[PDB]
Amino acid sequence: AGLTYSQLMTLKDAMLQLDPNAKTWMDIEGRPEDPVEIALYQPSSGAYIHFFREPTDLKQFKQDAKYSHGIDVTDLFATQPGLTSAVIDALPRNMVITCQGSDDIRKLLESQGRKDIKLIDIALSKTDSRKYENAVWDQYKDLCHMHTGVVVEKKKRGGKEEITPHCALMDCIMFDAAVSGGLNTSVLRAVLPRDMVFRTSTPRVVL
Ligand SMILES: [Mg+2]
Ligand SMILES: [Zn+2]
């Protein structure tokens, strides 16, 4: 039980908001065979696709949560099943996608039968990739609250050290800002409706 026919048609029309000739970044959290967060981003217009997926392998998810995304698995229980395959299905033919480390992105697209999509492998160094990390999280903190856990990294002299969690959306933004040499001035806008990315949406708080 994935997307209904009405959801698929809404997704198809929403994909027209993407400029197939403009630069499109993409990044994922989790392994390509079991992703939990997916983001596509067109900095020219600010349009972005952002959604989540419940993991199949809970054991590997715990490790990815500790060393990468810090997502609580219980926050993914209300995600829309089949949305990953549906979004990749609706991507324009022969689309060019930019990403930092295209290997895992390629495996994901190929598993969905999308070998027509051309990938541009950006190879930013570790220090260059995070040069705008603090600024992007500060400006776009409201766009993703899914990274609640403490993410750690091993240091060569013993013990762990907390790092900023990795977000597939903040990655697209901060990597594009590093390559562009400055943060984009466009106002970001979600392509996917909110009732499509989550099956149950919490209503706005009445104060
Ligand atoms: Mg990546
Ligand atoms: Zn995120």
mmCIF file with all atom_site columns, C-alpha atoms and ligand atoms in Angstrom:
data_model
loop_
_atom_site.group_PDB
_atom_site.id
_atom_site.type_symbol
_atom_site.label_atom_id
_atom_site.label_alt_id
_atom_site.label_comp_id
_atom_site.label_asym_id
_atom_site.label_entity_id
_atom_site.label_seq_id
_atom_site.pdbx_PDB_ins_code
_atom_site.Cartn_x
_atom_site.Cartn_y
_atom_site.Cartn_z
_atom_site.occupancy
_atom_site.B_iso_or_equiv
_atom_site.pdbx_formal_charge
_atom_site.auth_seq_id
_atom_site.auth_comp_id
_atom_site.auth_asym_id
_atom_site.auth_atom_id
_atom_site.pdbx_PDB_model_num
ATOM   1   C  CA . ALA A 1 1   ? 0.000  0.000  0.000   1.00 0.00 ? 1   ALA A CA 1
ATOM   2   C  CA . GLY A 1 2   ? 1.892  3.016  -1.326  1.00 0.00 ? 2   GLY A CA 1
ATOM   3   C  CA . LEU A 1 3   ? 0.612  6.223  -2.906  1.00 0.00 ? 3   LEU A CA 1
ATOM   4   C  CA . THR A 1 4   ? -2.976 6.426  -4.104  1.00 0.00 ? 4   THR A CA 1
ATOM   5   C  CA . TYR A 1 5   ? -3.831 7.381  -7.673  1.00 0.00 ? 5   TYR A CA 1
ATOM   6   C  CA . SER A 1 6   ? -4.730 10.901 -6.526  1.00 0.00 ? 6   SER A CA 1
ATOM   7   C  CA . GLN A 1 7   ? -1.410 11.224 -4.689  1.00 0.00 ? 7   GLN A CA 1
ATOM   8   C  CA . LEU A 1 8   ? 0.530  10.018 -7.739  1.00 0.00 ? 8   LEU A CA 1
ATOM   9   C  CA . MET A 1 9   ? -1.170 12.593 -9.972  1.00 0.00 ? 9   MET A CA 1
ATOM   10  C  CA . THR A 1 10  ? -0.536 15.338 -7.418  1.00 0.00 ? 10  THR A CA 1
ATOM   11  C  CA . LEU A 1 11  ? 3.110  14.245 -7.269  1.00 0.00 ? 11  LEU A CA 1
ATOM   12  C  CA . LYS A 1 12  ? 3.359  14.240 -11.074 1.00 0.00 ? 12  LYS A CA 1
ATOM   13  C  CA . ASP A 1 13  ? 2.095  17.825 -11.355 1.00 0.00 ? 13  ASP A CA 1
ATOM   14  C  CA . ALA A 1 14  ? 4.239  19.006 -8.441  1.00 0.00 ? 14  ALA A CA 1
ATOM   15  C  CA . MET A 1 15  ? 7.334  17.712 -10.267 1.00 0.00 ? 15  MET A CA 1
ATOM   16  C  CA . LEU A 1 16  ? 6.683  20.306 -12.991 1.00 0.00 ? 16  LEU A CA 1
ATOM   17  C  CA . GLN A 1 17  ? 7.889  22.882 -10.452 1.00 0.00 ? 17  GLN A CA 1
ATOM   18  C  CA . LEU A 1 18  ? 11.397 21.532 -11.085 1.00 0.00 ? 18  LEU A CA 1
ATOM   19  C  CA . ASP A 1 19  ? 13.391 23.108 -13.889 1.00 0.00 ? 19  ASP A CA 1
ATOM   20  C  CA . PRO A 1 20  ? 14.847 20.074 -15.714 1.00 0.00 ? 20  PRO A CA 1
ATOM   21  C  CA . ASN A 1 21  ? 17.623 22.236 -17.211 1.00 0.00 ? 21  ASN A CA 1
ATOM   22  C  CA . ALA A 1 22  ? 18.669 23.916 -13.949 1.00 0.00 ? 22  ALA A CA 1
ATOM   23  C  CA . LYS A 1 23  ? 21.137 22.630 -11.382 1.00 0.00 ? 23  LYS A CA 1
ATOM   24  C  CA . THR A 1 24  ? 19.621 20.091 -8.982  1.00 0.00 ? 24  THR A CA 1
ATOM   25  C  CA . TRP A 1 25  ? 21.431 18.891 -5.875  1.00 0.00 ? 25  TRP A CA 1
ATOM   26  C  CA . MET A 1 26  ? 20.502 15.610 -4.203  1.00 0.00 ? 26  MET A CA 1
ATOM   27  C  CA . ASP A 1 27  ? 21.596 13.922 -0.985  1.00 0.00 ? 27  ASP A CA 1
ATOM   28  C  CA . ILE A 1 28  ? 20.317 11.130 1.253   1.00 0.00 ? 28  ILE A CA 1
ATOM   29  C  CA . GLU A 1 29  ? 20.747 9.953  4.826   1.00 0.00 ? 29  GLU A CA 1
ATOM   30  C  CA . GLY A 1 30  ? 21.038 6.214  5.319   1.00 0.00 ? 30  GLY A CA 1
ATOM   31  C  CA . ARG A 1 31  ? 22.372 3.638  2.898   1.00 0.00 ? 31  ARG A CA 1
ATOM   32  C  CA . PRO A 1 32  ? 21.057 3.711  -0.695  1.00 0.00 ? 32  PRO A CA 1
ATOM   33  C  CA . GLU A 1 33  ? 19.260 0.379  -0.247  1.00 0.00 ? 33  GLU A CA 1
ATOM   34  C  CA . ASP A 1 34  ? 17.495 1.658  2.900   1.00 0.00 ? 34  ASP A CA 1
ATOM   35  C  CA . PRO A 1 35  ? 17.382 5.484  2.935   1.00 0.00 ? 35  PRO A CA 1
ATOM   36  C  CA . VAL A 1 36  ? 15.620 7.406  5.678   1.00 0.00 ? 36  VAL A CA 1
ATOM   37  C  CA . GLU A 1 37  ? 15.932 11.031 4.471   1.00 0.00 ? 37  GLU A CA 1
ATOM   38  C  CA . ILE A 1 38  ? 15.982 12.255 0.869   1.00 0.00 ? 38  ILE A CA 1
ATOM   39  C  CA . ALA A 1 39  ? 16.435 15.800 -0.420  1.00 0.00 ? 39  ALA A CA 1
ATOM   40  C  CA . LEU A 1 40  ? 16.614 17.389 -3.863  1.00 0.00 ? 40  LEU A CA 1
ATOM   41  C  CA . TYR A 1 41  ? 17.353 21.099 -4.169  1.00 0.00 ? 41  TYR A CA 1
ATOM   42  C  CA . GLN A 1 42  ? 17.376 23.618 -7.028  1.00 0.00 ? 42  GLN A CA 1
ATOM   43  C  CA . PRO A 1 43  ? 19.182 26.729 -5.721  1.00 0.00 ? 43  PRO A CA 1
ATOM   44  C  CA . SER A 1 44  ? 18.187 28.876 -8.720  1.00 0.00 ? 44  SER A CA 1
ATOM   45  C  CA . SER A 1 45  ? 14.524 28.957 -7.651  1.00 0.00 ? 45  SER A CA 1
ATOM   46  C  CA . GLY A 1 46  ? 14.759 27.713 -4.060  1.00 0.00 ? 46  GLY A CA 1
ATOM   47  C  CA . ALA A 1 47  ? 12.473 24.760 -4.788  1.00 0.00 ? 47  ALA A CA 1
ATOM   48  C  CA . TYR A 1 48  ? 13.322 21.638 -2.807  1.00 0.00 ? 48  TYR A CA 1
ATOM   49  C  CA . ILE A 1 49  ? 11.994 18.106 -2.435  1.00 0.00 ? 49  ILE A CA 1
ATOM   50  C  CA . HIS A 1 50  ? 12.331 16.782 1.108   1.00 0.00 ? 50  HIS A CA 1
ATOM   51  C  CA . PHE A 1 51  ? 10.809 13.676 2.682   1.00 0.00 ? 51  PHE A CA 1
ATOM   52  C  CA . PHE A 1 52  ? 11.543 10.755 4.983   1.00 0.00 ? 52  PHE A CA 1
ATOM   53  C  CA . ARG A 1 53  ? 11.223 6.984  4.985   1.00 0.00 ? 53  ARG A CA 1
ATOM   54  C  CA . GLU A 1 54  ? 10.932 4.360  7.705   1.00 0.00 ? 54  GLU A CA 1
ATOM   55  C  CA . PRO A 1 55  ? 14.029 2.118  7.774   1.00 0.00 ? 55  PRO A CA 1
ATOM   56  C  CA . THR A 1 56  ? 13.922 -1.603 7.100   1.00 0.00 ? 56  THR A CA 1
ATOM   57  C  CA . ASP A 1 57  ? 17.191 -2.400 8.918   1.00 0.00 ? 57  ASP A CA 1
ATOM   58  C  CA . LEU A 1 58  ? 16.771 -1.035 12.438  1.00 0.00 ? 58  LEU A CA 1
ATOM   59  C  CA . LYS A 1 59  ? 20.222 -2.269 13.491  1.00 0.00 ? 59  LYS A CA 1
ATOM   60  C  CA . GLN A 1 60  ? 22.000 -0.241 10.811  1.00 0.00 ? 60  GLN A CA 1
ATOM   61  C  CA . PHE A 1 61  ? 19.688 2.711  11.478  1.00 0.00 ? 61  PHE A CA 1
ATOM   62  C  CA . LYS A 1 62  ? 20.938 2.903  15.077  1.00 0.00 ? 62  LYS A CA 1
ATOM   63  C  CA . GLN A 1 63  ? 24.521 3.147  13.825  1.00 0.00 ? 63  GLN A CA 1
ATOM   64  C  CA . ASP A 1 64  ? 23.638 5.765  11.202  1.00 0.00 ? 64  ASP A CA 1
ATOM   65  C  CA . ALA A 1 65  ? 21.757 7.712  13.882  1.00 0.00 ? 65  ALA A CA 1
ATOM   66  C  CA . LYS A 1 66  ? 24.801 7.704  16.172  1.00 0.00 ? 66  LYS A CA 1
ATOM   67  C  CA . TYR A 1 67  ? 27.378 8.664  13.518  1.00 0.00 ? 67  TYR A CA 1
ATOM   68  C  CA . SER A 1 68  ? 25.360 10.685 10.997  1.00 0.00 ? 68  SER A CA 1
ATOM   69  C  CA . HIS A 1 69  ? 21.753 11.868 11.143  1.00 0.00 ? 69  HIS A CA 1
ATOM   70  C  CA . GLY A 1 70  ? 20.680 11.523 14.791  1.00 0.00 ? 70  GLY A CA 1
ATOM   71  C  CA . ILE A 1 71  ? 17.093 10.678 13.819  1.00 0.00 ? 71  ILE A CA 1
ATOM   72  C  CA . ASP A 1 72  ? 14.772 9.019  16.333  1.00 0.00 ? 72  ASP A CA 1
ATOM   73  C  CA . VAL A 1 73  ? 13.145 6.049  14.602  1.00 0.00 ? 73  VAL A CA 1
ATOM   74  C  CA . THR A 1 74  ? 9.819  6.810  16.324  1.00 0.00 ? 74  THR A CA 1
ATOM   75  C  CA . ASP A 1 75  ? 9.660  10.141 14.477  1.00 0.00 ? 75  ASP A CA 1
ATOM   76  C  CA . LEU A 1 76  ? 9.539  8.219  11.165  1.00 0.00 ? 76  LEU A CA 1
ATOM   77  C  CA . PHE A 1 77  ? 6.507  6.051  11.997  1.00 0.00 ? 77  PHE A CA 1
ATOM   78  C  CA . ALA A 1 78  ? 4.091  8.460  10.278  1.00 0.00 ? 78  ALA A CA 1
ATOM   79  C  CA . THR A 1 79  ? 5.940  8.708  6.950   1.00 0.00 ? 79  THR A CA 1
ATOM   80  C  CA . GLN A 1 80  ? 4.300  7.917  3.617   1.00 0.00 ? 80  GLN A CA 1
ATOM   81  C  CA . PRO A 1 81  ? 5.290  4.439  2.367   1.00 0.00 ? 81  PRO A CA 1
ATOM   82  C  CA . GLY A 1 82  ? 6.374  4.166  -1.245  1.00 0.00 ? 82  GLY A CA 1
ATOM   83  C  CA . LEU A 1 83  ? 7.159  7.887  -1.527  1.00 0.00 ? 83  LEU A CA 1
ATOM   84  C  CA . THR A 1 84  ? 10.843 7.229  -2.285  1.00 0.00 ? 84  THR A CA 1
ATOM   85  C  CA . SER A 1 85  ? 10.099 5.043  -5.315  1.00 0.00 ? 85  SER A CA 1
ATOM   86  C  CA . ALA A 1 86  ? 7.306  7.391  -6.404  1.00 0.00 ? 86  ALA A CA 1
ATOM   87  C  CA . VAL A 1 87  ? 9.464  10.535 -6.360  1.00 0.00 ? 87  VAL A CA 1
ATOM   88  C  CA . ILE A 1 88  ? 12.349 8.877  -8.216  1.00 0.00 ? 88  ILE A CA 1
ATOM   89  C  CA . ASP A 1 89  ? 9.787  7.556  -10.708 1.00 0.00 ? 89  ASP A CA 1
ATOM   90  C  CA . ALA A 1 90  ? 8.464  11.068 -11.396 1.00 0.00 ? 90  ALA A CA 1
ATOM   91  C  CA . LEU A 1 91  ? 11.903 12.626 -11.938 1.00 0.00 ? 91  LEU A CA 1
ATOM   92  C  CA . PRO A 1 92  ? 12.325 13.992 -15.493 1.00 0.00 ? 92  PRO A CA 1
ATOM   93  C  CA . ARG A 1 93  ? 14.036 11.791 -18.055 1.00 0.00 ? 93  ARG A CA 1
ATOM   94  C  CA . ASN A 1 94  ? 17.784 12.292 -18.596 1.00 0.00 ? 94  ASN A CA 1
ATOM   95  C  CA . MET A 1 95  ? 17.892 14.640 -15.603 1.00 0.00 ? 95  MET A CA 1
ATOM   96  C  CA . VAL A 1 96  ? 21.276 15.929 -14.428 1.00 0.00 ? 96  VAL A CA 1
ATOM   97  C  CA . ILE A 1 97  ? 21.738 15.676 -10.655 1.00 0.00 ? 97  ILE A CA 1
ATOM   98  C  CA . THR A 1 98  ? 24.628 17.137 -8.644  1.00 0.00 ? 98  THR A CA 1
ATOM   99  C  CA . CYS A 1 99  ? 25.793 15.546 -5.404  1.00 0.00 ? 99  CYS A CA 1
ATOM   100 C  CA . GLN A 1 100 ? 28.727 15.279 -3.008  1.00 0.00 ? 100 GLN A CA 1
ATOM   101 C  CA . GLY A 1 101 ? 29.796 11.661 -3.385  1.00 0.00 ? 101 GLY A CA 1
ATOM   102 C  CA . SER A 1 102 ? 27.631 10.281 -6.186  1.00 0.00 ? 102 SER A CA 1
ATOM   103 C  CA . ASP A 1 103 ? 28.319 6.600  -5.427  1.00 0.00 ? 103 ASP A CA 1
ATOM   104 C  CA . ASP A 1 104 ? 25.436 6.057  -3.009  1.00 0.00 ? 104 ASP A CA 1
ATOM   105 C  CA . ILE A 1 105 ? 23.112 8.324  -5.013  1.00 0.00 ? 105 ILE A CA 1
ATOM   106 C  CA . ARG A 1 106 ? 23.829 6.263  -8.134  1.00 0.00 ? 106 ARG A CA 1
ATOM   107 C  CA . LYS A 1 107 ? 23.005 2.974  -6.386  1.00 0.00 ? 107 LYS A CA 1
ATOM   108 C  CA . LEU A 1 108 ? 19.686 4.421  -5.210  1.00 0.00 ? 108 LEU A CA 1
ATOM   109 C  CA . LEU A 1 109 ? 18.673 5.691  -8.654  1.00 0.00 ? 109 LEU A CA 1
ATOM   110 C  CA . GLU A 1 110 ? 19.840 2.486  -10.355 1.00 0.00 ? 110 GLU A CA 1
ATOM   111 C  CA . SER A 1 111 ? 17.797 0.337  -7.961  1.00 0.00 ? 111 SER A CA 1
ATOM   112 C  CA . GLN A 1 112 ? 14.748 2.275  -9.206  1.00 0.00 ? 112 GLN A CA 1
ATOM   113 C  CA . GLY A 1 113 ? 15.724 1.757  -12.851 1.00 0.00 ? 113 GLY A CA 1
ATOM   114 C  CA . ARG A 1 114 ? 16.873 5.329  -13.451 1.00 0.00 ? 114 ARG A CA 1
ATOM   115 C  CA . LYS A 1 115 ? 20.196 4.859  -15.243 1.00 0.00 ? 115 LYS A CA 1
ATOM   116 C  CA . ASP A 1 116 ? 19.153 7.687  -17.588 1.00 0.00 ? 116 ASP A CA 1
ATOM   117 C  CA . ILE A 1 117 ? 19.845 10.239 -14.838 1.00 0.00 ? 117 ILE A CA 1
ATOM   118 C  CA . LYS A 1 118 ? 23.293 11.792 -15.244 1.00 0.00 ? 118 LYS A CA 1
ATOM   119 C  CA . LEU A 1 119 ? 25.234 12.454 -12.044 1.00 0.00 ? 119 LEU A CA 1
ATOM   120 C  CA . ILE A 1 120 ? 27.839 15.152 -11.422 1.00 0.00 ? 120 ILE A CA 1
ATOM   121 C  CA . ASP A 1 121 ? 30.197 14.023 -8.657  1.00 0.00 ? 121 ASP A CA 1
ATOM   122 C  CA . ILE A 1 122 ? 31.309 17.006 -6.584  1.00 0.00 ? 122 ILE A CA 1
ATOM   123 C  CA . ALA A 1 123 ? 34.397 16.163 -4.543  1.00 0.00 ? 123 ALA A CA 1
ATOM   124 C  CA . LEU A 1 124 ? 34.532 18.866 -1.885  1.00 0.00 ? 124 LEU A CA 1
ATOM   125 C  CA . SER A 1 125 ? 37.103 18.270 0.826   1.00 0.00 ? 125 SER A CA 1
ATOM   126 C  CA . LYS A 1 126 ? 35.881 17.725 4.377   1.00 0.00 ? 126 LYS A CA 1
ATOM   127 C  CA . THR A 1 127 ? 36.767 21.253 5.488   1.00 0.00 ? 127 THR A CA 1
ATOM   128 C  CA . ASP A 1 128 ? 35.407 22.864 2.304   1.00 0.00 ? 128 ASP A CA 1
ATOM   129 C  CA . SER A 1 129 ? 32.118 20.940 2.482   1.00 0.00 ? 129 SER A CA 1
ATOM   130 C  CA . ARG A 1 130 ? 31.286 22.282 5.968   1.00 0.00 ? 130 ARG A CA 1
ATOM   131 C  CA . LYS A 1 131 ? 32.480 25.870 5.499   1.00 0.00 ? 131 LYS A CA 1
ATOM   132 C  CA . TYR A 1 132 ? 28.852 27.089 5.573   1.00 0.00 ? 132 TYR A CA 1
ATOM   133 C  CA . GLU A 1 133 ? 27.519 24.398 7.936   1.00 0.00 ? 133 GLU A CA 1
ATOM   134 C  CA . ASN A 1 134 ? 26.878 26.753 10.850  1.00 0.00 ? 134 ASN A CA 1
ATOM   135 C  CA . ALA A 1 135 ? 25.321 29.456 8.664   1.00 0.00 ? 135 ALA A CA 1
ATOM   136 C  CA . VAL A 1 136 ? 22.980 27.080 6.829   1.00 0.00 ? 136 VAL A CA 1
ATOM   137 C  CA . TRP A 1 137 ? 21.683 25.493 10.037  1.00 0.00 ? 137 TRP A CA 1
ATOM   138 C  CA . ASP A 1 138 ? 21.171 28.972 11.498  1.00 0.00 ? 138 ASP A CA 1
ATOM   139 C  CA . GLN A 1 139 ? 19.180 30.279 8.523   1.00 0.00 ? 139 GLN A CA 1
ATOM   140 C  CA . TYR A 1 140 ? 17.244 27.076 7.711   1.00 0.00 ? 140 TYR A CA 1
ATOM   141 C  CA . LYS A 1 141 ? 16.754 25.478 11.138  1.00 0.00 ? 141 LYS A CA 1
ATOM   142 C  CA . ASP A 1 142 ? 12.961 25.653 10.737  1.00 0.00 ? 142 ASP A CA 1
ATOM   143 C  CA . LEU A 1 143 ? 12.994 23.398 7.651   1.00 0.00 ? 143 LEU A CA 1
ATOM   144 C  CA . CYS A 1 144 ? 13.907 20.134 9.417   1.00 0.00 ? 144 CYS A CA 1
ATOM   145 C  CA . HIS A 1 145 ? 13.524 19.209 13.090  1.00 0.00 ? 145 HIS A CA 1
ATOM   146 C  CA . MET A 1 146 ? 14.070 15.472 12.547  1.00 0.00 ? 146 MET A CA 1
ATOM   147 C  CA . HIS A 1 147 ? 17.689 15.474 13.817  1.00 0.00 ? 147 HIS A CA 1
ATOM   148 C  CA . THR A 1 148 ? 17.189 15.294 17.585  1.00 0.00 ? 148 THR A CA 1
ATOM   149 C  CA . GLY A 1 149 ? 19.874 12.845 18.697  1.00 0.00 ? 149 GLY A CA 1
ATOM   150 C  CA . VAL A 1 150 ? 23.484 13.530 19.606  1.00 0.00 ? 150 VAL A CA 1
ATOM   151 C  CA . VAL A 1 151 ? 25.842 12.632 16.751  1.00 0.00 ? 151 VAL A CA 1
ATOM   152 C  CA . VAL A 1 152 ? 29.425 11.760 17.686  1.00 0.00 ? 152 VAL A CA 1
ATOM   153 C  CA . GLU A 1 153 ? 32.745 11.282 15.912  1.00 0.00 ? 153 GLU A CA 1
ATOM   154 C  CA . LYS A 1 154 ? 35.833 9.383  17.017  1.00 0.00 ? 154 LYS A CA 1
ATOM   155 C  CA . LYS A 1 155 ? 38.968 11.410 17.711  1.00 0.00 ? 155 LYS A CA 1
ATOM   156 C  CA . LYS A 1 156 ? 42.479 9.974  17.536  1.00 0.00 ? 156 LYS A CA 1
ATOM   157 C  CA . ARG A 1 157 ? 43.223 10.483 21.259  1.00 0.00 ? 157 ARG A CA 1
ATOM   158 C  CA . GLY A 1 158 ? 40.346 8.595  22.895  1.00 0.00 ? 158 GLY A CA 1
ATOM   159 C  CA . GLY A 1 159 ? 36.672 9.302  23.509  1.00 0.00 ? 159 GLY A CA 1
ATOM   160 C  CA . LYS A 1 160 ? 33.961 10.732 21.281  1.00 0.00 ? 160 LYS A CA 1
ATOM   161 C  CA . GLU A 1 161 ? 33.196 14.314 20.285  1.00 0.00 ? 161 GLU A CA 1
ATOM   162 C  CA . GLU A 1 162 ? 29.778 15.669 19.356  1.00 0.00 ? 162 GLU A CA 1
ATOM   163 C  CA . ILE A 1 163 ? 29.365 16.982 15.808  1.00 0.00 ? 163 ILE A CA 1
ATOM   164 C  CA . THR A 1 164 ? 26.506 18.732 14.058  1.00 0.00 ? 164 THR A CA 1
ATOM   165 C  CA . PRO A 1 165 ? 24.018 16.133 12.748  1.00 0.00 ? 165 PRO A CA 1
ATOM   166 C  CA . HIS A 1 166 ? 23.928 15.487 9.004   1.00 0.00 ? 166 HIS A CA 1
ATOM   167 C  CA . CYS A 1 167 ? 20.722 16.529 7.217   1.00 0.00 ? 167 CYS A CA 1
ATOM   168 C  CA . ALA A 1 168 ? 20.096 15.631 3.578   1.00 0.00 ? 168 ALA A CA 1
ATOM   169 C  CA . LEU A 1 169 ? 18.483 19.042 2.994   1.00 0.00 ? 169 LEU A CA 1
ATOM   170 C  CA . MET A 1 170 ? 21.053 21.131 4.879   1.00 0.00 ? 170 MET A CA 1
ATOM   171 C  CA . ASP A 1 171 ? 23.732 19.163 3.010   1.00 0.00 ? 171 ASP A CA 1
ATOM   172 C  CA . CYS A 1 172 ? 22.337 20.168 -0.397  1.00 0.00 ? 172 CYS A CA 1
ATOM   173 C  CA . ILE A 1 173 ? 22.204 23.807 0.739   1.00 0.00 ? 173 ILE A CA 1
ATOM   174 C  CA . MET A 1 174 ? 25.631 23.959 2.388   1.00 0.00 ? 174 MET A CA 1
ATOM   175 C  CA . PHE A 1 175 ? 27.362 22.012 -0.396  1.00 0.00 ? 175 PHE A CA 1
ATOM   176 C  CA . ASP A 1 176 ? 25.876 24.288 -3.057  1.00 0.00 ? 176 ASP A CA 1
ATOM   177 C  CA . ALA A 1 177 ? 26.956 27.332 -1.047  1.00 0.00 ? 177 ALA A CA 1
ATOM   178 C  CA . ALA A 1 178 ? 30.496 25.934 -0.860  1.00 0.00 ? 178 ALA A CA 1
ATOM   179 C  CA . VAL A 1 179 ? 30.673 25.335 -4.618  1.00 0.00 ? 179 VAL A CA 1
ATOM   180 C  CA . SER A 1 180 ? 28.935 28.630 -5.449  1.00 0.00 ? 180 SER A CA 1
ATOM   181 C  CA . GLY A 1 181 ? 31.179 30.540 -3.045  1.00 0.00 ? 181 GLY A CA 1
ATOM   182 C  CA . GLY A 1 182 ? 28.363 32.112 -1.039  1.00 0.00 ? 182 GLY A CA 1
ATOM   183 C  CA . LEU A 1 183 ? 24.951 31.367 0.427   1.00 0.00 ? 183 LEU A CA 1
ATOM   184 C  CA . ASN A 1 184 ? 21.982 31.646 -1.913  1.00 0.00 ? 184 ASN A CA 1
ATOM   185 C  CA . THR A 1 185 ? 19.574 34.574 -1.562  1.00 0.00 ? 185 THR A CA 1
ATOM   186 C  CA . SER A 1 186 ? 16.422 32.837 -2.828  1.00 0.00 ? 186 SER A CA 1
ATOM   187 C  CA . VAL A 1 187 ? 13.602 31.918 -0.444  1.00 0.00 ? 187 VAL A CA 1
ATOM   188 C  CA . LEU A 1 188 ? 13.243 28.148 -0.208  1.00 0.00 ? 188 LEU A CA 1
ATOM   189 C  CA . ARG A 1 189 ? 9.910  26.503 -1.014  1.00 0.00 ? 189 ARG A CA 1
ATOM   190 C  CA . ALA A 1 190 ? 8.760  22.913 -0.548  1.00 0.00 ? 190 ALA A CA 1
ATOM   191 C  CA . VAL A 1 191 ? 7.679  21.136 -3.729  1.00 0.00 ? 191 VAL A CA 1
ATOM   192 C  CA . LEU A 1 192 ? 5.884  18.257 -2.012  1.00 0.00 ? 192 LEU A CA 1
ATOM   193 C  CA . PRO A 1 193 ? 2.617  18.913 -0.146  1.00 0.00 ? 193 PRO A CA 1
ATOM   194 C  CA . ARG A 1 194 ? 2.850  18.376 3.595   1.00 0.00 ? 194 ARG A CA 1
ATOM   195 C  CA . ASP A 1 195 ? 0.031  15.811 3.635   1.00 0.00 ? 195 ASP A CA 1
ATOM   196 C  CA . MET A 1 196 ? 1.993  13.774 1.070   1.00 0.00 ? 196 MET A CA 1
ATOM   197 C  CA . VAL A 1 197 ? 5.259  13.505 3.021   1.00 0.00 ? 197 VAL A CA 1
ATOM   198 C  CA . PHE A 1 198 ? 3.503  12.501 6.270   1.00 0.00 ? 198 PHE A CA 1
ATOM   199 C  CA . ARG A 1 199 ? 0.377  10.367 6.559   1.00 0.00 ? 199 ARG A CA 1
ATOM   200 C  CA . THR A 1 200 ? -0.694 12.073 9.804   1.00 0.00 ? 200 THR A CA 1
ATOM   201 C  CA . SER A 1 201 ? 0.010  15.806 10.077  1.00 0.00 ? 201 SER A CA 1
ATOM   202 C  CA . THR A 1 202 ? -0.176 17.489 13.469  1.00 0.00 ? 202 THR A CA 1
ATOM   203 C  CA . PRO A 1 203 ? -2.386 20.606 13.261  1.00 0.00 ? 203 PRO A CA 1
ATOM   204 C  CA . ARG A 1 204 ? -1.003 24.044 14.014  1.00 0.00 ? 204 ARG A CA 1
ATOM   205 C  CA . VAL A 1 205 ? -0.971 24.994 17.691  1.00 0.00 ? 205 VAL A CA 1
ATOM   206 C  CA . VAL A 1 206 ? -3.764 27.365 18.722  1.00 0.00 ? 206 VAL A CA 1
ATOM   207 C  CA . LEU A 1 207 ? -2.209 29.819 21.182  1.00 0.00 ? 207 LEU A CA 1
HETATM 208 MG MG . MG  B 2 .   ? 25.618 12.023 0.797   1.00 0.00 ? 1   MG  B MG 1
HETATM 209 ZN ZN . ZN  B 3 .   ? 16.924 16.724 7.946   1.00 0.00 ? 2   ZN  B ZN 1
#
